[PDB]
């Protein structure tokens, strides 16, 4: 028989971590003891647990260990390790694991993202642990100038406020203007500084606002008519503007402003409407190289001073960042896996974006050569399944957008290369996990397809698949999916709960004894999105009748629904600030962006070998036959 031990490759101190124990071919009852020792001396048993392997659990059991944060492990010199030893009766299995205490998360929410002098910055700091549960610890909170000078250093304990540090600060009337920074760190971890930024500009009271709407959200460099920009000028109280707009165009050359002086036109504004056109001959001559290709990758800015007809007020606005490209889309292969399986379909995930970085919705993309065509959704991602041949050659894939009313020279096109999985001893023993692309919400049920491909003498030896579900760098669910002989497709139904948000990895494998008498392990993994929801629940609704328009000074009733014992922090903000600077405002996706960076996997699936699957997904393996994984030193993954 073969005994196997699977743990996550980084174990957290003061945390419940899951150890998987499994006896391939066990008989009777096998008592297993798991011991955690200090590295490299093994002088102290840090954790000790017990379980059994029998026929009732299928010779597969899990063990929860909690390594305490001792004074030797808290030392700041060198990456520390522990040694986990599992004893399967008389056979011991032993693996050295990297450790990290972590338990550091600080989220900062300002009440708004732009301020005038004299305003009050209302800001909250939420103090949670590694499980995102509230902790009561001392936090040092620093407000810094745009030049970086600290003007306010607070120290607040979140023990009695239970994790919601609610504070305020008054901006003085004379102050630095620019991008201010709030910084926060725990008292026991000063090197983990978390930050949010806000902007302080000056008082602006327009009698009328000016909006510069270009006809397209980009400029085609081979467009003969040019770039039309609609001038929409209206009062803040709603009325229309009659007057005269003085409009000038220009080129933003990276970090360079080139004023097009020959584009300066006088435009009348009648009933709040006017039009200024930048002709193509003004754009080419005004930039110092008069090349259409040397204008690609730049943007057009446009400034317009609108005067009222009685000469009464002038309000000037600017629309920057209108790109001078030929393709309105950018193809990205960032959400797709980099490794394919031979003679099995490759789930290509093409991410199509607008030139400002926003996701391009409902854009048809076609792969060249295979003619697979799909549409993007609201997230900008399209799924194209490419049927691969039974070859271990690198698969070169070119994706091209095919939206109508756009010429073929103006379509986005990008090329990638996918690499094949390497089997043991050039054998035909493969595994492929096939998952349908649904925006998975908690409450939906996912059917996962377990495809087998083996040599015909090796097919009957496979009785089960052993699957593992990981979420937030922890083993969430382990089980077995059994298989009758002759079943080339086995389906595991999986209910998505709230513990799967934001994303989860499913890793599955089978073992066998091949035609050379050697123990072969074949594995596969897949990364699945979950719709950005919440581990708990928090809704704010109306408590009275659903009135569309309210009056000033009207009493309304708010209905606030949360979990039992939850503390809810509130703010009522004007809508005009929420839309302005969105990159500094706390959203629910920004919670799920932060935990997505803290993960122990680097690739969205597959690997170089059997040890390539466990290491790329965040696991490690040690078997009694000698099958193992490499050691992890760095929690990060390299980029050029």
């Amino acid at each position: 028989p073969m005994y196997s031990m699977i743990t996550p490759n980084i174990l957290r101190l003061e945390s419940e971590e899951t150890v998987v124990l499994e006896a391939h071919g066990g008989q009777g009852t096998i008592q297993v003891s798991v011991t955690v020792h200090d590295f490299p001396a093994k002088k102290q048993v840090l954790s000790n647990e017990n379980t059994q392997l029998n026929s009732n659990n299928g010779y597969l059991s899990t063990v929860t260990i909690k390594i305490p944060a001792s004074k030797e492990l808290k030392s700041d010199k060198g990456h520390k390790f522990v040694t986990v030893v599992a004893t399967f009766g008389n056979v011991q299995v032993e693996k050295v694991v990297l450790i990290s205490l972590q338990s550091g998360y600080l989220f900062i929410q300002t009440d708004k993202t732009i301020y005038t002098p004299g305003s009050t910055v209302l800001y909250r700091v939420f103090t949670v642990d590694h499980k995102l549960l509230p902790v009561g610890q001392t936090v040092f909170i620093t407000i810094e100038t745009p030049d970086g000078i600290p003007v306010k250093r607070d120290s607040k304990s979140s023990q009695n406020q239970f994790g919601i540090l609610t504070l305020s600060w008054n901006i003085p009337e004379l102050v630095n203007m620019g991008v201010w920074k709030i910084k926060a760190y725990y008292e026991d971890s000063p090197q983990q500084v978390f930050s949010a930024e806000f902007e302080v500009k000056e008082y602006v009271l327009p009698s009328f606002e000016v909006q510069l709407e270009p006809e397209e959200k980009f400029y085609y460099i081979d467009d003969p008519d040019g770039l039309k920009v609609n001038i929409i000028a209206r009062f803040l109280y709603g009325e229309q503007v009659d007057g005269t707009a003085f409009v000038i165009f220009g080129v933003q050359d990276g970090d360079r402003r080139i004023s097009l002086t020959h584009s300066l036109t006088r435009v009348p504004i009648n009933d709040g409407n006017g039009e200024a056109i930048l002709k193509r001959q003004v754009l080419l001559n005004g930039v110092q190289p008069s090349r259409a290709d040397a204008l690609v990758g730049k943007s057009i800015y446009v400034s317009a001073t609108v005067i009222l007809q009685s000469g009464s007020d002038m309000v000037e606005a600017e629309r920057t960042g209108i790109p001078i490209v030929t393709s309105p889309y950018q193809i990205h292969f960032t959400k797709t896996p980099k490794f394919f399986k031979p003679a099995m379909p490759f789930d290509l995930m093409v991410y199509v974006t607008n030139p400002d970085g926003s996701p391009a919705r409902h854009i048809p993309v076609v792969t060249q050569g295979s003619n697979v065509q799909s549409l993007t959704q609201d997230d900008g991602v399209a799924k194209l399944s490419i049927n691969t041949q039974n070859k271990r050659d690198p698969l070169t894939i070119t994706v091209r957008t095919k939206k109508d009313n756009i010429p073929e020279g103006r379509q986005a096109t990008r090329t990638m290369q996918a690499l094949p999985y390497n089997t043991q001893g050039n054998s035909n023993n493969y595994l492929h996990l096939s998952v349908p692309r649904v925006e998975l919400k908690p409450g939906e049920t996912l059917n996962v397809n377990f495809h087998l491909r083996t040599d015909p003498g090796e097919q009957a030896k496979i009785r089960y698949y052993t699957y593992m579900i990981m979420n937030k760098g922890k083993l969430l669910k382990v089980g077995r999916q059994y298989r009758e002989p002759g079943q080339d497709l086995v389906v595991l139904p999986l209910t998505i709960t709230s513990d799967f948000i934001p994303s989860f990895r499913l890793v599955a494998y089978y073992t066998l004894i091949n035609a050379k008498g050697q123990r072969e392990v074949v594995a596969d993994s897949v990364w699945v999105d979950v719709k950005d929801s919440c581990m708990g629940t928090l809704v704010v609704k109306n408590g009275g009748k659903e009135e569309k328009h309210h009056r000033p000074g009207q009493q309304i009733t708010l209905k606030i629904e949360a979990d039992q014992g939850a503390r809810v922090g509130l703010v009522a903000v004007d809508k005009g600030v929420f839309v302005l600077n969105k990159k500094n405002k706390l959203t629910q996706r920004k919670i799920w962006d932060v935990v997505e960076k803290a993960d122990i996997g680097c690739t969205p699936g597959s690997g170089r070998n059997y040890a390539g699957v466990f290491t790329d997904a965040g696991l490690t393996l040690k078997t009694s036959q000698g099958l193992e994984t490499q050691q992890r030193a760095d929690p990060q993954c390299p980029q050029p």
């Binding site: 929410q109 009440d111 708004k112 005038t116 209302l122 909250r124 939420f126 949670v128 995102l132 509230p134 000078i149 306010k152 919601i164 003085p172 004379l174 102050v175 630095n176 500009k201 602006v204 109280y237 000038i248 220009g250 002086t261 005067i307 009222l308 000469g311 009464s312 000037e316 600017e318 581990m535 708990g536 928090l538 704010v540 609704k541 309210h550 009056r551 000033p552 009493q555 309304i556 009733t557 708010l558 209905k559 606030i560 629904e561 949360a562 979990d563 014992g565 939850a566 503390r567 809810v568 509130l570 703010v571 009522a572 903000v573 004007d574 809508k575 005009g576 600030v577 929420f578 919670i591």
Partner: protein
């Protein structure tokens, strides 16, 4: 075609030289020629040559296109653009913890009733939860749109004047796109106002507002009383439940300028200034020759147990801190009021252990003030860690030193960035110190005493090198290991002042260099005897024609003597500095106040002979039957006791006991325009006139005018740092785009402008780097009138040096008599309602014998003096019918004063005879000159001449007036 060549010419220049050329092509409101605008350029000759080339380009090119234009130039692209940043303030900033009531799923529900704000906007309520079993969760946003469709905007002024007459607009908005709104609008009655709404009849108007439109409804209102009065306008929509009301407060400022007046400052020390242990001080009555008619005066007597007791108790209090200094802040040195008095008040109460009197929080509340002033002073920090006085000016070495001094003192109390402080120090040693120890000023000079004058190259840079050295000695321990040059630079500055000390001649420069040597122990020998012999009368280091500068010099000298441990020499210097409170009982400017506070607190710091305080002071006012007594002991709570009186009388203060104290007597009154005719060291000319019709004016602005202000200093050098204090007339507010042009350019004429809130009238403060002593410095900008005002009261322009408040000059400006700006905006009943304050045989005998009637005269008007505020009527008393409290004679002249409202009410004729009687409370002034007030209990009746009495229409009145005169002298009033 004109913006075309203006940008092709500006394209010829690059980098910072293009900004000089583009500013040469801008319009200038005073129409200076291109060579005159070049005189204000501070950037150097390369910027001036690019300025002149582009200025004279479009000067001759506009005069060519105008002289062939018979047969706007709105190009401010900026490239930066400031967008919308003012939104309504966020609310509902709470945390809810009562959520334990579980359902089947454990979901807890909270209901909460909240009130919406008055902002017509879409509110948006955001929620972040935190649960001990479920973690953090941010909700989706919940939007609450607030819209009433009909809303009212009430347009009030900043301030009106009592018995001035305005038109107030309520703008009513209606935006139903295609549905019009018939609305009745009502102005509510207020007895402090005088309008078409009375106590028995409301003033209702019925209007119809069109769809997607606005209608303004005017209301004419006369305020009759002084103080914060509410204007309430209500309006409700016909056949609907839509109703709105807007209530706003109309501040009616008293007429005239409000002038504080120090009557007396005295040192209270009966051990040294007492005869037989009893000190007696007589305080005179204040000179109220320039007082506004029908306003009250208010004398405030202040007794202080220590000479530092006012400044300490006012620097801890946050609102009282801003009223130590009488000048505005909002520039580089001036902004240090938020730090420097609060630092040395905490340092004083540190060294004397005295916070047991105050609250326990009072240290921590005052520590927050120094943190706020640290954030405010950091706004003036430039990019090279240096400090400039204004936002786009080159850095001042004098200022950057003074920031090092106050930051090093506040580093013991507040967390000051040491690295930034020593980087600011490292800029002073490397960039600004000459190798012979001299610190060089390459920015514009702020303080007057930082120039070595004329062909005395002696005393050149001595006052500045001393000022930097005091500052670097304060940051000696803070920037010790940070800057390895600080020990050598402090000694090099100390060697330069010691070697050049024999050449010094002015009392400020002898004193400020002595304290820089006293910190180094180098005020011995001939440096010591020159410092002591410079002092006049063994107690002050003063020079003629200097006020605040002398207070700084004596404070630097007191700090020099206390650093030398010369405690026996210092008590006369302490007593002198204690009583130089010329400006409202305080020291007026900033650097005067921060220096005498530091010197006086340093005396009480290391000479703690105040624990034996037992001062028994008694004040005897003649208006009170019993003398006020106060006892100030050392423990006895507050060390300051005050008394107030409404009478401007002389009184005697008697002090007994032990200790050294301070008496302060300040009279607050409203002053007219006659006392402001005196101008000292400055010269000022102001004129206002209506703008041309081709001038673009704002939409809510009814008229526009052009204000020209020209000033010139009358000294031997240019006046560094002066302020123009310009009050707007009622309804007026200046053009922001003119003031932005005058403050943003390489040809910069105004260092910074600001509008001063919490003031009497709407006041524009203009900051100037210099005022030329050779050429008259002029500036023009537009002011805009925003509603019709019936009897406009004149504005005021006051120029003064910031560091010497004696060097001031005030001028008043009013438009023309032909403007229709004096014509009463009222109709008839509203006119009469405003003429109550101005003012048949048995009826005359009763009204001349009412209890309170003092005098009855027959007068004759010789001369009217029509002034801007009040009318003087010089009358000759031709008959005395009832003798009053004023001892008058027949054919003796007396002044009769009425308000400019009463010019149409009275309609007096020069030369005509009049029967006048009034009350004794309308007597004003002190004998030999009593002025008479034509008030609401004063009778004015025309007496016809002896040729006019021969007409049949006047013969009954002349017999009624002759019967009244004989009855009132022979019989008098009935008993």
């Amino acid at each position: 075609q004109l913006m075309e060549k203006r940008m092709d010419k500006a394209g010829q220049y690059s980098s910072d030289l293009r900004k000089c050329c583009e500013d040469g092509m801008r319009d200038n409101p005073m129409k200076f020629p291109c060579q005159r605008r070049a005189q204000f350029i501070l950037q150097g000759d390369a910027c001036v040559k690019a300025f002149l080339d582009c200025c004279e380009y479009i000067t001759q090119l506009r005069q060519q296109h105008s002289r062939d234009g018979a047969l706007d130039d709105d190009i401010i692209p900026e490239e930066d653009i400031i967008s919308r940043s003012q939104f309504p303030e966020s609310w509902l900033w709470t945390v809810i913890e009562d959520l334990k009531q579980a359902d089947k799923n454990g979901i807890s529900t909270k209901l909460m009733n909240v009130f919406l704000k008055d902002s017509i906007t879409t509110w948006e309520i955001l929620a972040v939860s935190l649960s001990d079993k479920k973690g953090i969760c941010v909700a989706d946003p919940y939007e609450v749109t607030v819209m009433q469709d009909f809303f009212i905007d009430l347009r009030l002024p900043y301030s009106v004047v009592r018995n001035e007459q305005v038109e107030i607009r309520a703008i009513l908005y209606n935006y139903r796109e295609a549905e019009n709104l018939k609305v009745r609008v009502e102005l509510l009655y207020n007895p402090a106002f005088c309008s078409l709404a009375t106590a028995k009849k409301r003033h209702q108007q019925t209007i119809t507002i069109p769809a997607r439109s606005s209608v303004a409804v005017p209301y004419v209102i006369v305020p009759l009383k002084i103080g914060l009065h509410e204007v309430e306008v209500k309006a409700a929509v016909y056949n609907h439940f839509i109703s709105d009301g807007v209530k706003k407060t109309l501040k009616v400022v008293p007429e005239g300028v409000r002038v504080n007046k120090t009557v007396a400052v005295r040192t209270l020390n009966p051990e040294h200034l007492g005869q037989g242990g009893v000190q007696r001080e007589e305080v005179p009555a204040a000179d109220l020759s320039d007082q506004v008619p029908d306003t009250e005066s208010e004398t405030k007597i202040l007794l202080q147990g220590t000479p530092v007791a006012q400044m300490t108790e006012d620097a801890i209090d946050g609102e009282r801190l801003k009223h130590l200094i009488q000048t505005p802040s909002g520039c580089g040195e001036q902004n240090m009021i938020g730090m420097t008095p609060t630092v040395i008040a905490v340092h004083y109460l540190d060294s004397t252990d005295q916070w047991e009197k105050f609250g326990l929080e009072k240290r921590q509340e005052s520590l927050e003030l120094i943190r706020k002033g640290y954030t405010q002073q950091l706004a003036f920090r430039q990019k090279s860690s240096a400090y400039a006085a204004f936002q786009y000016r080159p850095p001042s070495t004098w200022l950057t030193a003074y920031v090092v001094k106050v930051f090093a003192l506040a580093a013991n109390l507040i967390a000051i960035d040491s690295k930034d402080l020593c980087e600011t120090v490292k800029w002073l040693i490397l960039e600004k110190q000459k190798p012979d120890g001299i610190f060089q000023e390459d920015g514009p000079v702020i303080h007057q005493e930082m120039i070595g004058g004329f062909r005395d190259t002696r005393e050149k840079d001595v006052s500045l090198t001393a000022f930097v050295l005091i500052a670097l000695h304060e940051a000696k321990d803070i920037c010790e290991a940070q800057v390895n040059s600080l020990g050598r630079s402090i000694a090099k500055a100390g060697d330069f002042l010691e070697n050049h000390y024999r050449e010094l001649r002015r009392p400020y420069t002898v004193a400020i260099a002595a304290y820089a040597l006293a910190l180094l122990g180098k005020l011995e020998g001939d440096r010591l005897t020159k410092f002591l012999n410079t002092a006049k009368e063994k107690n002050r280091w003063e020079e003629p024609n200097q006020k605040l500068y002398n207070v700084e010099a004596t404070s630097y000298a007191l700090l020099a003597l206390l650093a030398r441990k010369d405690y026996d020499t210092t008590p006369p210097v302490v007593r002198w500095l204690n009583e130089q409170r010329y400006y409202g009982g305080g020291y007026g400017s900033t650097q005067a106040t921060f220096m005498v506070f530091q010197a006086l607190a340093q005396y009480q710091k290391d000479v703690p002979d105040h624990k034996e305080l037992n001062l028994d002071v008694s004040i005897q006012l003649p208006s009170r039957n019993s003398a006020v007594r106060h006892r100030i002991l050392w423990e006895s709570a507050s060390l300051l006791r005050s008394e107030e009186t409404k009478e401007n009388e002389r009184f005697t203060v008697k002090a007994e006991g032990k200790g050294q104290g301070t008496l302060s007597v300040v009279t607050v009154y409203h002053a007219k325009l006659k006392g402001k005719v005196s101008c000292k060291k400055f010269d000022l000319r102001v004129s206002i006139r209506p703008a041309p019709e081709t001038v673009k004016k704002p939409q809510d602005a009814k008229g526009s005018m052009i204000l020209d202000i020209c000033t010139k200093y009358l000294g031997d050098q240019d006046a560094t740092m002066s302020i123009l204090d310009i009050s707007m007339m009622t309804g007026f507010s200046p053009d922001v785009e003119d003031l932005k042009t005058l403050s943003t350019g390489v040809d910069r004429y105004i260092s910074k402008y600001e509008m001063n809130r919490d003031s009497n009238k709407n006041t524009l403060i203009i900051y100037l780097d210099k005022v030329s002593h050779t050429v008259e410095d002029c500036l023009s900008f537009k002011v805009h009138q925003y509603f019709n005002v019936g009897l406009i009261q004149p504005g005021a322009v006051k120029v003064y040096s910031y560091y010497n408040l004696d060097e001031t000059c005030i001028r008043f400006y009013h438009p023309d008599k032909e403007d229709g700006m004096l014509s009463k905006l009222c109709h008839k009943d509203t006119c009469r309602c405003a003429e109550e304050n101005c003012f048949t045989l048995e009826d005359r005998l009763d009204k001349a014998c009412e209890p309170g009637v003092d005098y009855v005269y027959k007068t004759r008007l010789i001369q009217k003096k029509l002034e801007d505020d009040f009318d003087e009527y010089i009358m000759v008393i031709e008959n005395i019918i009832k003798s009053g409290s004023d001892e008058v004679q027949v054919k003796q002249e007396r002044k009769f004063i009425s308000h400019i409202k009463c010019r149409e009410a009275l309609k007096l004729k020069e030369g005509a005879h009049y029967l006048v009687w009034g009350v004794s409370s309308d007597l004003w002034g002190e004998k030999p000159k009593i002025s008479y007030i034509i008030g609401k209990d004063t009778w004015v009746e025309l007496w016809p001449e002896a040729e006019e009495c021969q007409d049949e229409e006047n013969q009954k009145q002349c017999e009624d007036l002759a019967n009244f005169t004989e009855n009132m002298v022979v019989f008098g009033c009935p008993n």
